[PDB]
Amino acid sequence: PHFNNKILEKCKEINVETVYDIMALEDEERDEILTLTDSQLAQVAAFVNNYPNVELTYSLNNSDSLISGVKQKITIQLTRDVEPENLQVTSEKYPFDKLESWWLVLGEVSKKELYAIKKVTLNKETQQYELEFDTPTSGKHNLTIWCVCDSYLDADKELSFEINVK
DSSP: OOOOHHHHHHHHHTTOOSHHHHHHOOHHHHHHHOOOOHHHHHHHHHHHHHSOOOOEEEEETTSSSOOSSSEEEEEEEEEOSSOOSOOBOOOSSOOSOOBOOEEEEEEETTTTEEEEOOEEOOOSSEEEEEEEEEOOOSSOOOEEEEEEESSOTTOOEEEEEOOOOO
16 A cells, blocks of 8 residues: 555665565664655555465375375365454455455466365464365376465465375
8 A cells, every 4th residue: 555656666775575575674764765644655554464364284084095087185284373353354445344365266377277275264273274286188188276365466376296196
């Protein structure tokens, strides 16, 4: 909220490129860059505090031994630093209400296909959800998980990996 072009140039000059870097700003740099009113700064703090900080961790149930055709199982674990008070989205431009939803996509970048998807809402400090998918053909593969938010840009995460299917 209220990040005009003069504030953006100041951040780019001191090498601040993300929303997480704004939290890392000291009391000295904060006062030089963020020259705003109390009501304007309130939305900056409200946004940056409610801005998500997930931690993707996947757990394949039987990675070494598995069969083609039968539906393979996979677990995806998300962990926040602390539990949020609410999941209601802070936004300047969007007028209506919105809660923080997520998608847990699993697919292959080379083949350009989605194996599985799971819409979730990261309420607790730590969660985990079980996805299932049809096991692909026997050979080399490069699967990639995508934990992606619907209400914030550049707050996403991913973990590419591979397995030898028999």
